[PDB]
Each structure stands twice: as C-alpha cells, then as structure tokens.
C-alpha cells in the first residue's frame, strides 16, 4: 500500500532540525544518535561508527564501508539504502531508526527494483505477492513488447538510441498552408546556425538563407560551405569537404533540448514552422555527432527474476440458457429501518444483452438467497465481451436502493468460461450514483477483502468450456439497387446522432456494400444484435477484411460503445499503421483513458502503447505521467501500476530523470501540505518567511534544482531564482517557481522557466480543454485561418495536483485595468486597455499588435462559445505586451450543465464587449459597425464553421474522456452540449444564423449591464 502523505516520518510533515535516531549496530548494540534532519547517510554512518566505539562489542565493528543501512519506510517495506548520498529526511522512514547490516544478494537487481518502485509510487514487491494468474502472466509476457522495443532501439546502435531519446518534434504534414508559405521570402527562410568554439563559451554565427524544405543535412552542408569559403580549396575540394563532413554533425535548438535528427523538411519541424508563423528568426546550433552520442548511456535491457490432458469443449457446442446461483452475502450495513435482493444482468459493454433477472426479497439482517437464477439468453449467442453486472439492493417496493455492486468478465483471459464456486468482494457506490447496477463500473473482485463479499456458484458443465477460435467463427459465417443517398449522409452524422431501428436494419441488410464507404463502420456496428452468434460471426468476418480508416475515426471504436475485441483489434491495427507519432502525442490523454475500458490486462492496445512509449521518449514521458497521476485511484491502481512497472523496467536511463522529477514533486506536495494544513491560519508574510527558510535548506535545493520539467522535458530546470519564487494569493496555496535555463545558449529562447505548482484543484478539466484548443488552432491554420491561440501547458500529476506553464509578460484585463494604474483616475475607465496596448506598441508596431489581438480574440471567443465555458470576465482573459489574447481557468465543462439545476443559458452577459471593441478597431465612438469589426465577424464565422466541419473529432474526444470520473463528463447527455452549440441537427446555413444571433444577443446584453468591479455582481 502506497504511503498516504509526503511527510518525512509517519504523521510528521517535517523532521525537527535535530532528530534522535535509534541505530541498530551489526553486533547487536542499539545506540541512540542525534542526527541533523538533512544529514546524509554517509555522515550519519561515520558519526555512528565513531560514537559506537563507546559501546561494547566495539572491536567486532568492521570498516564502515562493508556495511549498509536498512530501515522501514512509510510504505511498510525494508529499504536497503544502497545510495548513501540520500539524506535522512528523504529516506521516507516510518520511524527514525536505522539497522546496519552487510549486503546480501544481487545489488543491481535490488537497486533497479527500488528505482522502479520509487517511480511508480508503490514498491514492486507488492506485485510479486499477487496471486491472480492473469497478473503474473501479464507481468511475464509484456516483456515481449519490452524486448522488441529495446531491440528496435539498439537496431541502429549509434543513431537509433539518439532517435529514442530526442525524437524529431515535427508537424504531421510537410505541406505548408499558403498563408504561411507567403510569410517567407519566395519559398525560402532565413536561418542562423551557431557554433561554440571553446570551453568558457565563445560563439560564432553563420546566417544562411535556405530553402524552407531543406533537410538538416542540407542546412549543415550550406553552413560548411559558408565556412569553407574563406578556406583555400579547389572546387572539387570544396565538394569533397561537404560530401565527407555533411553527416559528421547535427543540429540542435538553441535554448532547449530538441534535435533535428531525422531526414525531414526544415519547415515540417515545429520550431522552424513556429519561427515562420511568428516571424521570429530560428537560431540553431551545430554539434558533432560524437559530442552527442558520447552523452548517451548505452542503456541495455536484462530480464527480471519473475520471467520464469484437460477436457475442453467449445462454447458453440453447449445447448442451454445461462444460469447462475446466488448463495449468500457476508454482511450488510443495514439499520433495519425498513428487505434486500440481488439484481443481476448480462451486459455487452454499456447495454445489457438480455433481460435483467433478480433474486427474492430476504431478511435485511440475515442475507441468504441460495437460488439458481435463469437468464433469458442462449449460451452460444454469447459474444466474447459478455460480462455480468450485479448488485445488492434494498426496499422500504416503495423506494428501491443499491448498496454494493460487482462486475465480472464472464470469460477468462485464457478464453475459458466461468463455472463452479466463486467469491466476489463488492465495491461501494459513487457519491451521486442512483442506478440499480454499475455497468460501466470496473470488472473484477475488490482487492479490499473487508468490504461486503458475495458468494455464488456458476453452472458447472461436464468439461472445461472455451470460446471458439476465429476459424470456427468463420466456418459458421459461411452460412441491391440505389439507397446510397442515405449512406453518404448517416456516415456524416455525429456519433451521438440517433440510430433508428429502421436505419439499424437498413444498415445491417446492406452491410456487404458498406465496405465501399468504410468510415460508416462505427454506425454499422451499433446496428448489430450482439446476442446472436449468427450476426456476431458475420460481423467478425466483415471486421477482419475492413478497409483501414483514418485514425481519428478509428479512435471512436475504442470508446465505451464498442467493447467487442475484434472491433478494438481493428482500431489498434489502424493506429499501428496510419497514426503519426505527432498526433499520438496530440491525443495521448484519450488514448490512456481508453485503456480502462478493455476487458483484460494483456491486450493489443496496451502492447501498442507500451511499444510506442519505449520507442519514443517524448511519448513515454507523458505516458508515464498520465499513468502515475491515476495511481491514487484504487479502481485503476493495479492495471496502471503493472503497466508502469513494464515501462520503467524497459525505458532505460530516462528512469533516473523521472525519479528526479518525482522526488521534486514529492517535496513540493509536502511543502504545500504544510502551507495548507498546519500553517493554515498563518499570515502570508509568515508563510513566505517559512517558505524562504525551508527552500534554502539543502535537501530542497538539491532535490528541486537541475532536472527536467514534466511540462516539457525538452526544458531543463536549472537553479531556483529564489527571489522570484513565491506563494500565490489563491486560497489553495500554490507555488510560483522560477528556474534558470541551464542551456549553453539559454539566451536564444527561454531566459527563465516559470511554473505554477497548485495543490488543491482538479486539473483534468483544464487539460482536456487546452488539448482541444490546441486541436482547434491546428485546424484553423491548416485551413488558412491565422487565429493565434495560446494553449499553455498543463499536466495533472496526481489527485488534484499538477503543474501550469507561466506565460511570460502577460496580464489579466483585471490587472491591465489596475496594473496600468489609476493615472489620476480611481476608475480604470474600460478604454484603458486600448491605451495600455498603445503605450506598449507605438509607431508601426501598433497595427500589427492590433491584428494579433483581434486574430487571437476571435478564436478564443469562438472556442469559448462552442465549448461550455462560462464565467468569462476581466480575470480570466489575459493579454501579452505584443497583444495576444488568451483565456485561463477552464474549470467547468458544457456550461455547468451538471451544475445547479439546468434552467439557465437563456441569457449570458459578456462584460468586456466594449473594452475589446475599442481595441478591435481604434477610436470611433460608433465601433459597433466599422470595417475592422466586419473582418472580425467574418473571422469568427469561418472559425465556427471550420470546427463544425470537423465536429465528429471533438465528439469522439469527449466520448473517450468518459473513463475519467470528471465532474462535467459522466454521461453522453453531457457531451450533447456541443451538439447544440454547433447545431448539428440544423443545416449548415441555419447554424450560421444560430451563431450570429447568440453573439449579437451577448454583445448588446454587455453594452447594457454593469460589472461592480471586485465581486462582479450586476446593477443592469
């Protein structure tokens, strides 16, 4: 069991400066020794063996080198501390004692397992103790994918390793939209390649003008030419110079660790494309290939220590209906304020296969049924994804109610069918769950064996049942006109569009034609009757030979509506062939969340994701963090922890950097815990006093300086600029942290790294929002609509704990109004925004900054409408000095639809319509109607329609993010909001009227209302 707090001892957040430590010596002598809380094990051992010569049996003490410290951690394990640099407080001790022993066993294995356990947040030994055969079979077998990935890493010994660690950060397509192509000079771009010439860094430039579509090797060649111009060489001599030394060098981004290792167009690289769009000049750095491969570890992979006639008929042979016995329940916490019954039912994912059957009403105090329930369904008609959802409910007849639920996969991971006696510990009911069963609920028995444990007996047949192999299903499978107008219209309707029974059977009938229009496969699968081996067998054979569809559409087949294994296998194969690494990073959140839905531990999706994580560290990093940030939840803990064990046992030497990140986050969690709990009611001056005091201590400085930012491990975090670090005003007690950028030329990118660490709020909302904002900006730019967004980084690292990128030199409109000053006027006056933008952008800069403002503002307005985001006043919208607008605080989904009662959204007043209308076109008291506002409107309209054109994508995104128990993402009814904002039922040209009407209404409502500054109440 993982430890509950990030304290240094059990129930103490911080060790007092001086602690008494009971040292158990290797001669059986106990010696209490006063240690400093920050003291290393080295010095503690030294001062122990010094003051231990005072105690008897002192001659037996060997050299202190030949001994190692051992103790009990807060996880309740024996940690043998092999690293003796570690400080006392960083030991995570249960209580302050230290046993001194001599080393035993293999040291390498002990160390590696301890590092894996630290990374996870759970000691690895707990997995060894687990007895479920599926768990150990997964642990053993998944190493196949691990070995394959490490083999691909060492396939090209020098280069492939570099590709694994520093994969090319590129866009999906090299095709450069034309409004971007125009931004550069006649099809080419200005670039600056730098060279570091000596150690105590001197620097020399090479300003090149290069075709925008050149590969890195070609850029290096042009730089070599630049240098070998002053050189005295023949024409064929220059030729031989370049030819031989083209590929003896490599390019890096000045100021971060992103390298141009692959043969891509320079514009396809995200950094250079960014430079083009933003008009900034790319600053690269030349570097000898040897000078990089030297800094690679050569990390290998070695197998762990856990890598160590029966009568069977097929399921197609059994003739009977499914029947299961309900024996008894250990206990129920009933008040006897009323009779209970066991409601059961067989389900194929969300929907039940047959009709739900119940047990009899029995005494509440004495719980026994012992009754053989029959289910109205045929046994061979069972699909592969069949499973049993059941629950214990109560009565007053008058008022039903559920108490403890449970789900079980009706087949094994081996394909065997359940039979005989079984005990299932039940799970509790979520806070606001009033359903009689838990269908979407996780499958399997409760690890907590103390909660209610139901016992039952499934039907035992003559032999051991199994689900038939695919060939038998194909054997079974082997037994017009023109209605195509519809097929090319129902395949274009969003996933949540109703599927009528007429259309269901119309699709199932003309199914062998559907292959022509492959993207209709989702809808088609929903129109199948899954409790029929007949239709299931036919559909299987259609699935196997189905045309690969675009990856964005195949993701749909991985959400909850499609639980059949062949469907998911098809989607996984689609991803394996057609999905780019770029978008795999882009959609990783949904891909990780979707692992939960799969029936069994070992499957095709987990293997695919683990392989791609062990093949690309930019995937593997966020793969790791997304899995670790869900280890707090017990329902997923085991699956995600086993997967994390698999990854950490193969990622190689990045594991140590991950450990550094974990260590740092742990210290931050603990510090904020103190600020929130113990020092709750202290003034801010004293909390900041404590903050400075505690950060300056060496355990913190060492632990939280020099590591990779989890927000983007391409950024190194250097030394803390403490004078900038501060506690934020927010009640939840955040931490504003500032690092130097250690990069050799941090001058050419990030001067300062600034991150917010907040311990309090759930960030999954913000994360999903920003990811969607990012997707939208991508869509608009591919369609030649230059709307510059700012989807700042955000990463949840644990239960309501995460990180937030800071945007340099940005301010809230609240600020700009106040920050701009009073200037003699108690009131900001609302105009001020325009004059603050004018005071920071003068001359010709003014017009371009205004363009930036309007282009950003339009996109953010459209996105704030399409997505259910309200609460948009002068404290959520921010402006940079160059004039880029961007929104923050994406806390609520789908317009608080879950929240409150549901009778609003008829009227929404936007406060700052005038304040922006002044910037979007200067002056002119009538800026209700100017040419520039007309251009603003056209932009917003085009953006709205552009998202509407791709709507299915966002529907699928939200539908995949239903695995996460998010506040405003629980049922499809939630997701149905964007169907209304986009008006997918209304025709393309009716939806533009929808949008324009809503916008006009909000604008005028804003013209009238009053803001009441601080509390933002109204006056009308």
């Amino acid at each position: 069991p993982p430890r509950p707090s990030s304290g240094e001892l059990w129930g103490i957040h911080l060790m007092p400066p001086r602690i008494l430590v009971e040292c158990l010596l290797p001669n059986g002598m106990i010696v209490t020794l006063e240690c400093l809380r920050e003291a290393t094990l080295i010095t503690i051992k030294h001062e122990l063996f010094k003051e231990a010569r005072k105690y008897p049996l002192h001659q037996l003490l060997q050299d202190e080198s030949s001994y190692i410290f051992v103790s009990v951690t807060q996880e309740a394990e024996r940690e043998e501390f092999f690293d003796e640099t570690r400080r006392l407080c960083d030991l995570r001790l249960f209580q302050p004692f230290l046993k001194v022993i001599e080393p035993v066993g293999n040291r390498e294995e002990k160390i590696l397992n301890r590092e894996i356990g630290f990374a996870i947040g759970m000691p690895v030994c707990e997995f060894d103790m687990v007895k479920d055969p599926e768990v150990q079979d997964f642990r053993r077998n998944i190493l196949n994918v691990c070995k394959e990935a490490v083999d691909l890493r060492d396939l090209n010994s020098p280069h492939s390793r570099a590709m694994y660690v520093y994969p090319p950060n590129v866009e999906s397509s090299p095709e450069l939209p034309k409004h971007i192509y125009n931004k550069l000079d006649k099809g080419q771009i200005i670039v600056v390649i730098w060279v570091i010439v000596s150690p105590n860094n001197d620097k020399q430039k090479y300003t090149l003008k290069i075709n925008h579509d050149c590969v890195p090797e070609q850029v290096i060649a042009e730089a070599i030419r630049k240098k070998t111009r002053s050189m005295l060489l023949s024409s064929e001599q220059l030729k031989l110079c370049v030819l031989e030394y083209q590929g003896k060098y490599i390019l890096k981004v000045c100021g971060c660790d992103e390298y141009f290792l692959e043969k891509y167009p320079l514009s396809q690289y995200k950094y250079i494309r960014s430079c083009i769009m933003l008009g900034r000049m790319p600053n690269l750095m030349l570097m000898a290939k040897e000078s990089l491969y030297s800094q690679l570890p050569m990390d290998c992979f070695t197998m762990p220590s856990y890598s160590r006639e029966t009568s069977t008929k097929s399921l197609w042979v059994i003739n009977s209906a499914l029947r299961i016995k309900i024996l008894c329940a250990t206990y129920v916490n009933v008040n006897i304020r009323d009779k209970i019954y066991v409601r059961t039912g067989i389900y194929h994912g969300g929907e039940p296969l047959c009709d739900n059957v119940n047990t009899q009403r029995v005494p509440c105090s004495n719980p026994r049924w012992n009754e053989w329930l029959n289910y109205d369904i045929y046994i061979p008609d069972l699909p592969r994804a069949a499973r049993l959802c059941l629950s214990i409910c109560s009565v007053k007849k008058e008022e039903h109610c559920p108490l403890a639920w449970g789900n079980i996969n009706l087949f094994d991971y081996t394909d065997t069918l359940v039979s005989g006696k079984m005990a299932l510990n039940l799970w509790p009911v979520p806070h606001g769950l009033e359903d009689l069963l838990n269908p979407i609920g996780v499958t399997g028995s409760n690890p907590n064996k103390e909660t209610p444990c139901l016992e039952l007996e499934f039907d035992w047949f003559s032999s051991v049942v199994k689900f038939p192999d695919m060939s038998v299903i194909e054997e079974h499978a082997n037994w017009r006109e023109n209605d195509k107008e519809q097929l090319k219209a129902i395949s274009t309707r969003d996933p949540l569009s109703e599927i009528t029974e007429q259309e269901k059977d119309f699709l199932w009938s003309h199914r062998h034609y559907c292959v022509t229009i492959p993207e209709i496969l989702p809808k088609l699968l929903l129109s199948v009757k899954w409790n029929s081996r007949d239709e299931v067998a036919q559909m299987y054979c259609l699935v196997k030979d189905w045309p690969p569809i675009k990856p964005e559409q195949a993701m749909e087949l991985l959400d909850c509506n499609y639980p059949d294994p062949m469907v998911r296998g098809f989607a996984v194969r689609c991803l394996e062939k057609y999905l780019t690494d770029d978008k795999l990073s882009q959609y990783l959140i949904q891909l990780v969340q979707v692992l939960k839905y799969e029936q069994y531990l070992d499957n095709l999706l987990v293997r695919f994701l683990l392989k791609k994580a062990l093949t690309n560290q930019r995937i593997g990093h966020f793969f790791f963090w997304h899995l670790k940030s869900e280890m707090h939840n017990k329902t997923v803990s085991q699956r995600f922890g086993l997967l994390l064990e698999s990854y950490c046992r193969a990622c190689g030497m990045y594991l140590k950097h991950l450990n550094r990140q974990v260590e740092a986050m742990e210290k931050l969690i603990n510090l904020t815990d103190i600020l929130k709990q113990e020092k709750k009611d202290e003034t801010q001056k004293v909390q900041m006093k404590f903050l400075v005091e505690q950060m300056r201590r060496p355990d913190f400085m060492d632990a939280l300086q020099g590591f990779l930012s989890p927000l983007n491990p391409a950024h190194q975090l250097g030394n803390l600029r403490l004078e900038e670090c501060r506690i934020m005003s927010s009640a939840k007690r955040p931490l504003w942290l500032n690092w130097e950028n250690p990069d050799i030329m941090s001058e050419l990118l990030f001067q300062n790294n600034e991150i917010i660490f907040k311990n309090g709020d759930d960030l999954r909302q913000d994360m999903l929002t920003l990811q969607i904002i990012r997707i939208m900006e991508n869509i608009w730019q591919n369609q030649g609509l230059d709307l510059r967004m700012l989807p700042y980084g955000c990463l949840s690292i644990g239960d309501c704990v995460g990180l937030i990128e800071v945007v340099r030199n940005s301010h809230t409109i609240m600020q700009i109004q106040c920050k701009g000053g009073l200037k003699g006027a108690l009131q900001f006056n609302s105009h001020t925004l325009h004059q603050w933008l004018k005071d920071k952008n003068k001359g010709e800069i003014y017009d371009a900054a205004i363009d930036l403002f309007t282009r950003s503002c339009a996109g953010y307005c459209v996105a704030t409408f399409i997505l259910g985001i309200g609460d948009r006043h002068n404290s959520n919208i921010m402006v940079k000095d160059d004039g880029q607008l961007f929104h923050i605080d994406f806390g609520h989904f789908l317009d608080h639809k879950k929240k409150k009662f549901g009778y609003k959204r008829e009227r929404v007043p936007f406060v700052l319509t005038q304040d922006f209308l002044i910037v979007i076109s200067k002056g002119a008291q009538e800026c209700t109607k100017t040419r520039e506002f007309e251009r603003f409107q056209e932009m917003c309209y085009k953006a709205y329609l552009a998202i509407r054109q791709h709507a299915n994508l966002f529907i699928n995104l939200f539908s995949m993010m239903l695995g996460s128990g998010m506040p405003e993402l629980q049922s499809f009814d939630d997701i149905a909001y964007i169907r209304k904002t986009l008006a997918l039922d209304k025709t393309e040209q009716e939806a533009l009227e929808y949008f324009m009407k809503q916008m006009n209404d909000a604008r005028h409502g804003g013209w009238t209302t009053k803001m009441d500054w601080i509390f933002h109440t109204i006056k009308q």
């Binding site: 059986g28 309740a76 004692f97 008040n335 039912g345 039940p352 108490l403 806070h431």
Partner: protein, 239 residues
C-alpha cells in the same frame, strides 16, 4: 385520439428526458416524440429502441406498405418480432400549487447537506482506516528487525559474555546486559504502540459501519425527493 390528448405524448423533450422516464422499467414503457416529424420510443429486451414514423401526404407507417392515415390509430393497431406495447407514461401525475414546492425541495437540499456532512466523514474515515492498516504492517516488520537484532546480539555477545565470566569482569557484562535489556524494552514499547493502533483500528471499523448504515438509511429518501420537486416550464425566477 387527437393531435395532443395528454396520455402518452410529449413534445421535443430531449433524449435525456426519456431514458430516465423509462429507466429500469418493464418491457413496454413507451412514448411518442418528434424528430428532425414523429418518433416512437419503445422498451424491450432490457433496452430502449427507437422507431421513426414517416409522415408524408398526411399518412403514417413503419414498413414499406403504409397501413394508416392518422397518428393515434397506429398505436392501438399494434397495441393489441413486433411485440406489443404495454404501459404508457401518463402526463397528469400530481389551486396555484407553487409555494408548497418549497417545503418539498427544502427537504432535499438539507437532506443532501446532511448526506454531504456524512459522505465527507465517510471518505475521511475510509482512507484513515487504510492508513492505520499499513502502519500496523509497518510496526510488525519493524518488530521483526529488532527481533533479528536481538539474534545478532545473543550470538556475537555470548562469546564475549561467556569469555569475561571466565576472566572475572561482571560490571563489563553489566553494560552488555543493560544494552540487551534496553533493546528488549524498545521491542515491548513498539508492540504496545501497535496494540493501541489495533484498538483504534476496531474503533474506526465500528464508526465506519455506523456511517455506512446512516447512509443506507438516507439514500432511499433523496431519490424520492428528486421526483417531488419537478419544475413547470415557461416561468421565470421562481425561488
């Protein structure tokens, strides 16, 4: 039989207000809706099926051969695998009865608050239990180490102790015995801290189930207080 009779017909009420109007209901509970037109929502197989009614030339039907020219004859035809319809969802289900709809909502919110003032003290208790479970596990292993430490003593020492006795040095062995005695003392002290933590374990295991019982008593009420406070459409800012 008319355009709107108020027996099984609603307007364009969303799909969110259908599933819950026939959730966990028998094979039958049905209603008529509108489409992007008419719609028929039906229940069978433990599932919710959706059938469209094509209305062209003022006529209605399902299959290809049209067999009706009105809305309400269609229902009674099949009413008495096209399985029949059973139970309809009535429209009139319970002078200016609006003020009374405070007293029935004031229960829910307060009964929600009192449930929230319980689920919190359920979660807080729940995790607090697991904490103590692990701490006992910690103490156990800690004890083992000290018991192993004692084995190290009564083995390395019993060669010096049984060497000074044959040499004459009692108050040297008295130091070794003072040490061993303090070692055993720090064993019994840990055992007692662990026994007290098991006492708190069972205290919290009883308090936990009391919280669970109270929740099991409260829960049936909140669901029934959900259907009593339904709103009336078309009216603004009722409190």
């Amino acid at each position: 039989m008319s355009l709107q009779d108020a027996e099984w017909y609603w307007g364009d009420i969303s799909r969110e207000e259908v599933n819950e109007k026939l959730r966990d209901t028998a094979d039958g509970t049905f209603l008529v809706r509108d489409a992007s037109d008419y719609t028929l929502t039906l229940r069978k197989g433990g599932n919710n099926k959706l059938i469209k009614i094509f209305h062209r030339d003022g006529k209605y039907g399902f299959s290809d051969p049209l067999t009706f020219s009105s809305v309400v004859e269609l229902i009674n035809h099949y009413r008495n695998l096209d399985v029949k319809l059973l139970y309809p969802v009535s429209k009139y289900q319970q002078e200016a009865v609006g003020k009374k709809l405070h007293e029935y909502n004031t229960q829910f919110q307060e009964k929600s608050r009192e449930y929230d003032r319980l689920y919190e003290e359920y979660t807080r208790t729940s995790q607090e239990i697991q904490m103590k479970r692990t701490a006992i596990e910690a103490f156990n292993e800690t004890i083992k180490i000290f018991e192993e430490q004692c084995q190290t003593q009564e083995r390395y020492s019993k060669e010096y102790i049984e060497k000074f006795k044959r040499e004459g040095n009692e108050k040297e062995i008295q130091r070794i015995m003072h040490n061993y005695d303090k070692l055993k003392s720090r064993i019994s002290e840990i055992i007692d801290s662990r026994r007290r933590l098991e006492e708190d374990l069972k205290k919290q295991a009883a308090e936990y189930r009391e919280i669970d019982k109270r929740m099991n008593s409260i829960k049936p009420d909140l669901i029934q207080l959900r259907k009593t406070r339904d709103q009336y459409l078309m009216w603004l800012t009722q409190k």
